[PDB]
C-alpha cells in the first residue's frame with residue numbers, strides 16, 4: 001500500500017516521510033528528482049526552460065520513468081539513467097523556474113502516479129490531490145508560531161510572517177484529508193513524530 005504524509009509549510013512532512021520510508025524499507029517519492037530531470041532534459045535538448053509547450057512535448061515524447069528504490073530513486077528518459085546528472089549547478093540554476101510551470105507540475109504528478117506501490121510520499125501537491133486513495137494517510141499539524149519558532153530566534157518575526165502568508169494562501173489545504181489521521185507535533189521531536197507514524201501503520 002501507499003503511505004502519505006501531508007501538512008503545512010515547515011511541518012517537517014518531508015523529513016518524516018523520508019525516515020518512515022527508511023524504517024519500512026520502502027522508497028520515499030521525492031518530487032525534486034523529476035523536476036530536476038525536466039530541467040536537465042530541457043537544457044540538453046536546447047529547449048528553453050521557460051517554453052512550457054515545448055518542454056512538455058519533449059518530456060511526454062521521451063517517456064520518463066521514476067524508478068523507486070529504498071536505496072535511492074533513479075530517473076530514466078527513453079531508457080537512459082539520468083540520475084547522476086541531476087544535481088549540477090546548471091540544473092540547479094533553472095530548476096525552480098521549471099517547477100513553477102503548471103503543466104510541468106502535472107507531468108511530474110502523472111510520473112508519480114505511475115510508480116507501483118509500496119512507498120511513502122506526500123499526498124498532495126498544493127491544491128492537487130496526487131494520492132487521494134492511499135491506504136495510510138497522516139496529516140502533521142502545528143501552530144505557525146511553533147513551526148516558525150523551530151524554523152528559526154530573533155528571525156522568528158520574519159519566518160512567522162512568511163509562514164502566515166503561506167497559511168493564508170493555502171487556507172483550503174490547511175486541513176487533513178477526510179480519512180487522514182491527525183497529529184499535532186507540538187512538543188515532539190522528529191524521532192517522536194516518526195515513531196508515532198510507524199506505530200499507527
Ligand SMILES: Nc1ccn([C@@H]2O[C@H](COP(=O)(O)O)[C@@H](O)[C@H]2O)c(=O)n1
Nearest residue numbers: 030031032033035036095096097099100
Ligand atoms: N514538492 C516539490 C519538490 C521540489 N520542487 C522543485 O524542485 C527543487 C528541489 O529539488 P530537490 O528537492 O531535489 O532539491 C526546488 O527548487 C523546487 O522548485 C517543487 O517545486 N516541489
